[PDB]
C-alpha cells in the first residue's frame, strides 16, 4: 500500500466563509447527473420535494417527476402496479439490489452519491481531480480488461470507465458543453446535494459568531473592571506610608 | 441547599494569583451539561436498529427543523470535552497538585476513564463503517477471558443487540459522571486549591466578584469557538469514512480514529505482542494512579515548586506532552517500517518519562 | 461530516470571454496543458530515464509508475491555477 | 350492541395449577392445523426450531419442513429463488399480503393465530365453544350470502364457514376422528403455541412460591420474637408494684 | 397476556372406553344432546311462543333471536359437563 | 452519608402502636426500586419503531433466556404500585394526616400525578390496538389549546415519532420520582408520624429492632404475591385486546382500560360535555390539594380523632371509597342507559363526599 497524493485546491464559489452555493451551476449539474451519472449510481436519500424553491420552480419539478414510472400498491386485488412519479417520491435507482449492480458492473459496486463529497478526503477537489484523472498506463504496467488507469484514484486502477465526453449533454441556459465544464457543474450539484442546509447553516453562523464576539468584548471589560481594584491595592506593615 | 450554594460558590475564598489555567475544570463541567442537553434532545428522534440507525441520523439532518444544529453541536463539543480535560490534567502534572490533593487526583482519574467509555460508546451509535469495525477491534482486544466477549456483544458478532445495549449504556453513564463530579468537588474543597507559585499564603480574596467574572469570560470564548467550528467547519476533526454504510465482509482501506484516540492507536501499531499492547495501557494508568501517594516514596520533605521557569533541563511533564503529540502524529500515518521505528522511540520516551515522576 | 471545509483567502476568477462563440467547443485544458508540460520537465526527464533502464535490465521485471504519477500530479497542480477562468 | 354470553368451562388438562400441557393432544392439534386451518390462517411467529424436543423429535421436524418451498436470495445474478424449507424457517403463509387475504375471503381478514388464546376472552373455552357454535338462523333473521350464524361469535354472524367435518383428517396414534375430538386437540395445540414457555414458567413458579412461603413463616416468628418484649413490659408510676 | 388463567378444583374425567371400536366414528355430542334438550325446555317454550307471536303481529317486523340464543347457551352449558369423558 | 443513615433508619424513634397500616409507604418505594431494575433490563432489548415494536416485545418472550420473567414481573408490579398507593392514601384520609403533615401531603399528590403519567406512557410502548387508541383518546382529551396536540404528538396522528419520545419520557420520569421521594421524606421527618389513636405520646420506641422487622415481614408477603400472580396468572388484570397488532382505521369492538384507570373512564362515559369531563378531574384534584390547610377553614380548634369506630354515621372517606369502587364497576361495563344512570348517581356521591371534607 501507499500514501495517495493530495488534490489541488480549486476555487469553487462556495468554499469561502461568506459565500453560498451557485445555483445556475447546481441546475446544470443536476441536468448532467440525470443524463449521465444516474445510469449506474443512485441517490436514495433525495426526494423531488428538495428541489422546489431551492434550485428549481415547483411546476418544472412536477414535470420532471412525471417522467418516471414508480411502483406502488398493493391494490384491491393485492397486486402491485406502476404510476407516474409525484413530488413526494424519492429519486429512482437503476438496479433492484446490490447483487444486480455488481452483476452489471463486472463485480464492483457503484456507491450511492447521497453523501459523496462528505465521504472522501478533500471532497469536491478530489472528485474534480478524479474526473480529470484518466490516462494511459505507465511503462511496465498492464490492466486486465474492464479496468482503467486513473492518476488520482487510490492504487491508480479503477473500474469506472472514462466518465465525460464533449457535448454528450446540453444546457438550457446556453452555456457551452465540455468535460471540464461538466465536471465543475456536476461537482457543484453533488456538493449541494450532500447537505442542502448549507446556506442556512452559514448565514445563521455569521449572526451567531458576530454577536458572541461582541459579548466577549463586553465581558472582558467587565472582568477588568474588577481586576483593577485589587491589582492596584496597597498593603503596609507596621505604619502607613502613603495616602 | 441555598446555604451550601452560598458557602461554596459565593463566599469561598481563593488566592489572588489564580490565572486562567485554573478555569478549565468549570469549563469541562459546562461542556458536560451542554452535551447532556443535546444528548437528550437527540434521543427523541434516534432509532436503535441495525437495519435503519444510519438513515435515522440522516433524517434529523434532512427533514427536521434545526435538526442539523443539535447533531453538530453534540459532535463538536466532544472534542472540546477532551481538549479541556487534557489541559486540566497537564496543569496539575505541571504543578504537582497530587502532592496533597490525593483523593481529588484519584477521582479525576476515574472521571477520565468514565469519559473515555462514554465517548467510545457514543462513537458506535451512528452505525457506519468506522463504527462497526472500531467496535469489532476493541471487543477483540478484551478477548483474553472466555465467553466474556460474546456475552458483552450479545452475540457472536457485532449486532443490533449490541447497538441496543450500547445506546442504553451511553444514556446512563454521563449521569454517573455527574455523581462522581460531586464526589470530586467534595475532596477538592476539603483541602483547598494550590497556587501557581506553590506557596501557602494569607492574601486570599472571595470568589463571587473576582474569579466568577474570569470563569464567565472564558465561558464566552468557549461558546464562541464551539459555534464557529460547528457552523462553518474549519477543521476536519472527524474522518469521512463513517459516512459509508456498514459492510460486514469488507474493511475501509484507510483507518483513522477520532483524534483523542490516536495515541492509543499508535501503540497498537508498534508493539508486537497484543498482550504487551494492552499491558502498556494498564501500566501507564497504574503509574498515574501511583502519584497519589508520592510523599511516601521518599523521606526527603517535599515541595511543590518544580522550578521549570528558565530551566534548560525542562521537566518530565513537558517531555511527556511532546512524546504524546509525536505519538498522535504517528498514529495518523500509514503502517510503514520507519514510522514504526520512530513510533518505538516515542513509545519508550512516553513510558520512561511517566515512570520517572516518582524518583525525586 | 461536512460536505467541505472552508479555505481562507481563496481567489475567485473573472470569466474571460471566449474570443469566438465557437472557441470553447474544445476543452480549455488543452490550452493550459503545454505551459505546465514545460514546467514539469524534470519529471519527464526521470520518467524517460526509468523507461530506458527498465527496457535494458533484461531480468524481466520493472516498471516506472512512480515517476509517471509524479509527472501528472505536477501537471495537474499547475493546470488547476487557470482552468476556472475559462468556465462559467 | 350487546353483552355477549360467557362460555362454559371445559376441563382441559392444563388449566390446573400443577399440570403441564398434554403433548399427544398437541401433536394431534398440530396435525389438524396443518391439514385444515393453515388453508387461510397464518402463524408468523412460529419456526420449526420450536417443535424439536418439546413436541416432536428432530428428524421428523426436518422431514416436515422439507415439504414446503421457501423463497430465498438474491443469487449471483440478483434473482430470487425457491428452496426446500429448513429447521430455521418460519411457518409458511397462504397469502402474500392482507389485501389478497381479504380478496380471497369476501372482505374479512383471517387473523394470525400466533397468540389467539391470549387475544380473546376466556381463551380456549371461547375457542372450543366457537368451533361448536354453528346453527341455523332464528325466526326473523336472514344473513347475506357468504355469512353464517354462530351462537357464540359476538353479534352471532361470522364470516368463517363451518370449520370441522368428521374424518376430514386422520391421526397417527390411532385415535378416532370427529369434530369434538378435533376441537379439543387443535385448541390444545394453539394454547401451547400461544406461549411454549408455559411449563417452564409453572415449574419454576412452584419452587419460588414454596420457598418464599417458608421464608414468610420464619420472618413472622422473628418479628414476634421482638414484639413480645415490649408487649409484656411493665411501667409503674410513683412506686414499684410487682417484681 | 397469559394464554389462560388457572381454575381451582377442576375435575378431570377418566376416558370411558367405547363399547365398540366403531362407536365414536359418530360425534359423542349426539349422545349428550337429548338430555340437555330436555333440561332446557322452558327456553324451547318461550322460543315457540315468540315464533307464534311474531308470525301473528302482521305489522311485518319481528324476530326471536334472543330466546334462541338463550336456548342454545343453556344446551351447551349442559353438554360441557360430560363431553370430555368421551374424548382421549 | 452513613451518619444520616443511622439517624433516620436505625435510631429514629416511633410510637409503640404503629400497626401494619403504616408499612405501605416502604412498600411502594420497594415496588419503585424493583420496577426500575426490571425497566432497565427490558430497555436493553426493546425496539422503539412503529413498524416493529410489537415483535420486539414478542422476541423477549419467545427467544431469550428468562425473557418472559422480566416482562411479566414488570407488568404485574405496576398493579401493586397502584394498590399500595391507594391503601397509603386512604390511610391518611382516614386519620386526617394532612392536619399537620401539610407539605408531605402536597408532595404525595405530586408523586401520584408523576406515577399516573409514568404508567400511561409505559402503557403505549408495547404498541397494540389498545395502546394506539388509548393514546389517540387521551391526546384528543387535552385538545382545547391549538397546535399543542400535533406538537406533543410530533405529527398529525400517533406515530413512530410519538413512540420514540414516549419511550424516552418513560425512561426519565421514574428518576424524577426518586428525587421527589427524598423531598417527601424530608417534609415527613421534619414533623414526625401520627398514631392510629391520634394522640401525642411519650411512649416511643426505636425503629431498628421493632419496626424494621414488620417492614421485612410485609415485604416477604408482597414478594410472594407478586411472584404468585406473575408465574401462574390467577387474575385477568390486563385485557387481551393489546395482543392484536394496531390498525389505524378500525377500533376494537370492546374497550376496558387497566383497572387503575377505570374510574376515570367511567366519568368520561357519563358526563355529557367533554369539558365538564376534564373539569371534574381538575376539580377533584384541587379539592384534595385544598386539604393541606384545613386548619384555616374554621376557627374551632381541630382534633385528629374522627371517632369512626362503632359509629353508625360511618365517615366521608368510607363513602368515598365505596363510591370509587362503584365507579370502577360501572367503568367496566358497556355503555347503556341504566349503567349511565347509576353512574351519575355514583358520580354525584364521589364529588360531594370530597367537597364535604372541609366542613368540620
Ligand atoms: C493565549 C493562550 C490561549 C490558550 C488557549 C488554550 C486552548 C483552549 C481550547 C479549548 C477552548 C477553551 C476556550 C477558552 C480558552 C482560554 C481563553 C482565555 O482566557 O485565555 C487567556 C489567555 C492567557 O491568560 P493568562 O492569564 O496569561 O493565563 C495564564 C498562563 O497560562 C500562564 O500560566 P502560568 O504561568 O501559571 O503557567 C502554568 C502552566 C500550566 O501548564 C499548562 O497549562 C500547560 C498546558 C499545555 C497543553 C497540554 C495539553 C495538550 C493536549 C494536546 C492538544 C493537541 C491539539 C492539536 C491542535 C492542532 C491545531 C492545528 O502553563 C504554562 O506553562 C503555559 C505556558 C506555555 C508556553 C508555550 C509557548 C509556546 C510558544 C509557541 C510559539 C509559536 C511560534 C510560531 C511561529 C510561526 C512562524 C511561521 O489570554 C488570552 O487569550 C488573551 C486574549 C487574546 C484575544 C485575542 C483575539 C484576537 C482576534 C483577532 C481577529 C482578527 C480578525 C482580522 C480581520 C481582518 C479583516 C480585514
Ligand atoms: C388481613 C388484612 C390483609 C390486608 C391486605 C391488603 C391488600 C394488600 C395488597 C398489596 C400486597 C401487599 C402485601 C402485604 C399485605 C399486608 C400483610 C400484613 O402484614 O397483613 C397484616 C394483617 C393485619 O395486621 P394488623 O396489625 O391487624 O393491621 C392493622 C389493621 O389494619 C387495623 O388498623 P387500624 O385499626 O389502625 O385501622 C386504620 C384503618 C386505616 O384505613 C385503611 O387502611 C383502609 C384501607 C382500605 C382500602 C382502600 C383502598 C382500596 C382501593 C381499591 C382496591 C380494589 C381492589 C379490587 C380487588 C378485587 C379482588 C377480587 O384501617 C382500617 O380501618 C382497616 C379495617 C377494615 C375493616 C373492613 C372489614 C371488611 C369485612 C369483610 C367481610 C367479608 C365477608 C365475606 C363473606 C362471604 C360469604 C360467601 O394481618 C394478617 O394478614 C395476618 C396474617 C394472616 C396470614 C394467613 C395466611 C393463610 C394461608 C392459608 C393457605 C391455605 C392452603 C390450603 C391448602 C389445602 C391443601 C389440602
Ligand atoms: C456506469 C458506466 C457508471 C457511470 C455512468 C458513472 N459511474 Fe461512478 N462508478 C461506477 C463503477 C462501476 C464504480 C466502481 C469503481 C471501483 O473502483 O470500484 C464507480 C465509482 C465511482 C466513484 C468512487 C470513487 C472512489 O474513489 O471510490 C465516484 C466518486 C464516482 N463513481 C462518481 C461518478 C460520477 C460523478 C459520475 C457522473 C459523472 C459517475 N460516477 C458515473 C459506475 C459508473
Ligand atoms: C378459510 C376457509 C378458513 C379456515 C380453513 C379457517 N378459518 Fe378461521 N377465519 C376465517 C375467516 C374468513 C375469519 C373472519 C371471521 C369474521 O367474522 O371476520 C376467521 C376467523 C377466525 C377466528 C376469529 C374469531 C373471533 O371471534 O374473532 C378464529 C378464532 C378462527 N377463525 C379460528 C380458526 C381455527 C381454529 C381454524 C382451524 C379449525 C380456522 N379458523 C380455519 C377463515 C378460515
Ligand atoms: C459527557 C457527556 C457525553 C459525551 C462526551 C458524549 C459523546 C458522544 C459522541 C462522541 C457521540 C458521537 C456523535 C457522532 O459521531 O456524530 C455521541 C452521540 C450520541 N450521544 Fe452522546 N455523549 C454524552 C452525553 C450524552 C447523553 C447524556 C445522551 C442522552 C441522554 C447522549 C446521546 C447520544 C446520542 C443519541 C448520540 C447519537 C448521535 C447520532 O446518532 O448522530 N449523549 N455522544
Ligand atoms: C469531568 C471531569 C472533571 C471535572 C468536571 C473537574 C472539575 C474540577 C474543578 C471545577 C476544579 C476546581 C477549579 C479548577 O481547577 O478548574 C478541579 C480541580 C482539580 N481537578 Fe478536576 N475535573 C475533572 C477532571 C479531572 C481529572 C481527569 C483530574 C486528574 C487526572 C483532575 C484533578 C484535579 C485537581 C488535582 C484539581 C485541583 C488542582 C489544584 O488545586 O492545584 N480533575 N476539577
Ligand atoms: C415506577 C416506575 C415504573 C412504572 C410504574 C412503570 C410502568 C410500566 C407499565 C405499566 C408498563 C406496561 C407493560 C405492559 O403493558 O406489558 C411498562 C413498560 C415498560 N417500561 Fe416502565 N415503569 C416504570 C419504570 C420504568 C423504568 C425506570 C424503565 C427504564 C429505565 C422502564 C421501561 C419500560 C419498558 C422498556 C417497557 C416496555 C415493556 C414491553 O414493551 O413489554 N420502566 N412500564
Ligand atoms: C411513590 C409514592 C410514595 C412513597 C414512596 C411514599 C413513602 C412514604 C413513607 C416511607 C412514609 C412513612 C412510612 C409510611 O407511612 O409508610 C410516608 C408517609 C406518608 N405519606 Fe407517603 N409515599 C408515597 C405517596 C404518598 C401519597 C400519594 C400521599 C398522599 C396523597 C402520601 C402522604 C403521606 C402521609 C400523609 C404520610 C404520613 C402519615 C402520618 O404520619 O400520619 N404519600 N410516605
Ligand atoms: C479559578 O479558581 C477556581 C475556580 C473554581 N470554579 C468552580 C466552578 C468551583 C466550584 C465548582 C463546583 C462547586 O459545587 C458544585 C459541585 C458539583 C456540582 O454538580 C455538577 F455536576 F457540577 F453540576 C455543582 C456544583 C463549587 C465550586 C471551584 O471550587 C473553583 C475553585 C477555584 Cl480555586
Ligand atoms: C411503620 O412506621 C414507619 C415506617 C417507616 N418506614 C420507612 C422505610 C421510613 C423511612 C424511609 C426512608 C428514609 O430515608 C430515605 C429517603 C429517601 C430514599 O430514597 C429512595 F428513593 F427511597 F431510595 C431512601 C431513604 C428514612 C426512613 C420511615 O421513616 C418510617 C416511619 C414510620 Cl412511622
Ligand atoms: O484498528 C482500529 C483501532 O485500533 C482502534 C482502537 C483505537 C483505540 C481505542 C482505545 C484504546 C484504549 C482506550 Cl483506554 C480507549 C480506547 C480502541 C480502538 C479504532 O478505534 C478503530 C476504529 C475503526 C477501525 C479500526 C480501528
Ligand atoms: O376510550 C378510552 C378512554 O377513555 C381511555 C382513558 C382512560 C382514562 C385515562 C386517564 C384519565 C385521567 C387521568 Cl388523570 C389519567 C388517565 C385517559 C384515557 C382509555 O384508556 C382508552 C384506551 C383504549 C381505548 C379507548 C380508551
From Swiss-Prot, chains B, F:
| Membrane topology qualifier | Multi-pass membrane protein
Subcellular localization: Mitochondrion inner membrane
**UniProt-listed InterPro entries:** Cyt_b/b6_C, Cyt_b/b6_C_sf, Cyt_b/b6_N, Cytb/b6-like_sf, Cytochrome_b_N_euk/bac, Di-haem_cyt_TM
Q: Does the keyword Ubl conjugation apply?
A: no
Give the principal location in a single coarse category: mitochondrion
Where along the chain is heme b b566 bound? 88, 184
* Binding-site positions, a ubiquinone: 189
Gene Ontology MF term list = metal ion binding; ubiquinol-cytochrome-c reductase activity
- SUPFAM superfamilies named among the record's database cross-references: a domain/subunit of cytochrome bc1 complex (Ubiquinol-cytochrome c reductase), Transmembrane di-heme cytochromes
- rRNA-binding in keyword set: no
Q: Name one Pfam family in it.
A: Cytochrom_B_C
Family annotation (Gene3D superfamilies): Cytochrome Bc1 Complex, Chain C
Cofactor(s) in the UniProt record: heme b
- Cofactor binding comment, as recorded: Binds 2 heme b groups non-covalently.
Binding-site positions, heme b b562: 74, 170
Q: Which Gene Ontology BP annotations are present?
A: mitochondrial electron transport, ubiquinol to cytochrome c
Annotated function = Component of the ubiquinol-cytochrome c reductase complex (complex III or cytochrome b-c1 complex) that is part of the mitochondrial respiratory chain. The b-c1 complex mediates electron transfer from ubiquinol to cytochrome c. Contributes to the generation of a proton gradient across the mitochondrial membrane that is then used for ATP synthesis.
Q: Which family does it belong to?
A: Belongs to the cytochrome b family.
Give the protein name, as stated in the record.
Cytochrome b
Q: What is the lineage of its organism?
A: Eukaryota, Sar, Alveolata, Apicomplexa, Conoidasida
State which gene encodes it.
MT-CYB
Amino acid at each position: 500500500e501507499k500514501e495517495p497524493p493530495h488534490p489541488p485546491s480549486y476555487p469553487f464559489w462556495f468554499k469561502s466563509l461568506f459565500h453560498s452555493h451557485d445555483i445556475p451551476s447546481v441546475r446544470r449539474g443536476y441536468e448532467v447527473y440525470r443524463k449521465v451519472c444516474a445510469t449506474c449510481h443512485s441517490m436514495e436519500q433525495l426526494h423531488f420535494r428538495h428541489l422546489v424553491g431551492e434550485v428549481l420552480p415547483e411546476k418544472r419539478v412536477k414535470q420532471i417527476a412525471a417522467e418516471y414510472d414508480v411502483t406502488d400498491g398493493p391494490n384491491d386485488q393485492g397486486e402491485m402496479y406502476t404510476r407516474p412519479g409525484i413530488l413526494g417520491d424519492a429519486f429512482p435507482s437503476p438496479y433492484p439490489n446490490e447483487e444486480a449492480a455488481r452483476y452489471a458492473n463486472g463485480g464492483a459496486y457503484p456507491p450511492d452519491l447521497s453523501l459523496i463529497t462528505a465521504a472522501r478526503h478533500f471532497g469536491p477537489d478530489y472528485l474534480m481531480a478524479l474526473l480529470g484523472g484518466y490516462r494511459d498506463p505507465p511503462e511496465g504496467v498492464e490492466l486486465r480488461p474492464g479496468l482503467y488507469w486513473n492518476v488520482w484514484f487510490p492504487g491508480n486502477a479503477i473500474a469506472m470507465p472514462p466518465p465525460l465526453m464533449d457535448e454528450m449533454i446540453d444546457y438550457e441556459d446556453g452555456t457551452p458543453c465540455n468535460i471540464s465544464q461538466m465536471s465543475k457543474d456536476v461537482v457543484n450539484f453533488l456538493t449541494w446535494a450532500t447537505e442542502p442546509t448549507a446556506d442556512e447553516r452559514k448565514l445563521y453562523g455569521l449572526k451567531c459568531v458576530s454577536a458572541i464576539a461582541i459579548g466577549t468584548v463586553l465581558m472582558t471589560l467587565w472582568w477588568r473592571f474588577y481586576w483593577a481594584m485589587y491589582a492596584t491595592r496597597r498593603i503596609d506593615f507596621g505604619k502607613l506610608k502613603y495616602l | 441547599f441555598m446555604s451550601l450554594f452560598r458557602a461554596h460558590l459565593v463566599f469561598y475564598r481563593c488566592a489572588l494569583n489564580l490565572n486562567s489555567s485554573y478555569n478549565f475544570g468549570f469549563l469541562v463541567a459546562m461542556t458536560f451539561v451542554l452535551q447532556i442537553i443535546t444528548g437528550i434532545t437527540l434521543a427523541f428522534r434516534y432509532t436503535s436498529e441495525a437495519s435503519c440507525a444510519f438513515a435515522s441520523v440522516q433524517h434529523l439532518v434532512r427533514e427536521v427543523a434545526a435538526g442539523w444544529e443539535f447533531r453538530m453541536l453534540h459532535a463538536t463539543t466532544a472534542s472540546f470535552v477532551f481538549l479541556c480535560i487534557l489541559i486540566h490534567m497537564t496543569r496539575g502534572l505541571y504543578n504537582w497538585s497530587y502532592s496533597y490533593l490525593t483523593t481529588a487526583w484519584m477521582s479525576g482519574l476515574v472521571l477520565y476513564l468514565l469519559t473515555i467509555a462514554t465517548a467510545f460508546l457514543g462513537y458506535v451509535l451512528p452505525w457506519g463503517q468506522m463504527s462497526f469495525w472500531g467496535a469489532t477491534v476493541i471487543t477483540n482486544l478484551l478477548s483474553p477471558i472466555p465467553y466474556l466477549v460474546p456475552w458483552l456483544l450479545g452475540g457472536y458478532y457485532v449486532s443490533d443487540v449490541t447497538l441496543k445495549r450500547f445506546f442504553v449504556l451511553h444514556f446512563i453513564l454521563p449521569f454517573i459522571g455527574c455523581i462522581i463530579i460531586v464526589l470530586h468537588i467534595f475532596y477538592l474543597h476539603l483541602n483547598g486549591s494550590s497556587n501557581p507559585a506553590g506557596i501557602d499564603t494569607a492574601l486570599k480574596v472571595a470568589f463571587y466578584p473576582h474569579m466568577l467574572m474570569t470563569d464567565a469570560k472564558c465561558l464566552s470564548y468557549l461558546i464562541g469557538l464551539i459555534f464557529l467550528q460547528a457552523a462553518f467547519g474549519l477543521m476536519e476533526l472527524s474522518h469521512p469514512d463513517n459516512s459509508i454504510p456498514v459492510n460486514r465482509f469488507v474493511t475501509p482501506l484507510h483507518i483513522v480514529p477520532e483524534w483523542y484516540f490516536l495515541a492509543y492507536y499508535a501503540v497498537l501499531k508498534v508493539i508486537p505482542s497484543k498482550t504487551g499492547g494492552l499491558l502498556v495501557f494498564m501500566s501507564s494508568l497504574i503509574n498515574l494512579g501511583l502519584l497519589s501517594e508520592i510523599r511516601a516514596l521518599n523521606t526527603r520533605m517535599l515541595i511543590r515548586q518544580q522550578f521549570m521557569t528558565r530551566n534548560v533541563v525542562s521537566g518530565w511533564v513537558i517531555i511527556w506532552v511532546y512524546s504524546m503529540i509525536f505519538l498522535i502524529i504517528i498514529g495518523s500515518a500509514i503502517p510503514q517500517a520507519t514510522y514504526i521505528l520512530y513510533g518505538r522511540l516515542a513509545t519508550i520516551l512516553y513510558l520512561t518519562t511517566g515512570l520517572v515522576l516518582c524518583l525525586y | 461530516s461536512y460536505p467541505y471545509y472552508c479555505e481562507f483567502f481563496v481567489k475567485f476568477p473573472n470569466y474571460i470571454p471566449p474570443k469566438d462563440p465557437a472557441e470553447r467547443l474544445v476543452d480549455p485544458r488543452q490550452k493550459l496543458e503545454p505551459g505546465c508540460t514545460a514546467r514539469c520537465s524534470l519529471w519527464v526527464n526521470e520518467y524517460d530515464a526509468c523507461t530506458k533502464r527498465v527496457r535494458a535490465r533484461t531480468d524481466n521485471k520493472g516498471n516506472c509508475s512512480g515517476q509517471y504519477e509524479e509527472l501528472h500530479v505536477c501537471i495537474d497542480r499547475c493546470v488547476a491555477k487557470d482552468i476556472f477562468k475559462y468556465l462559467k
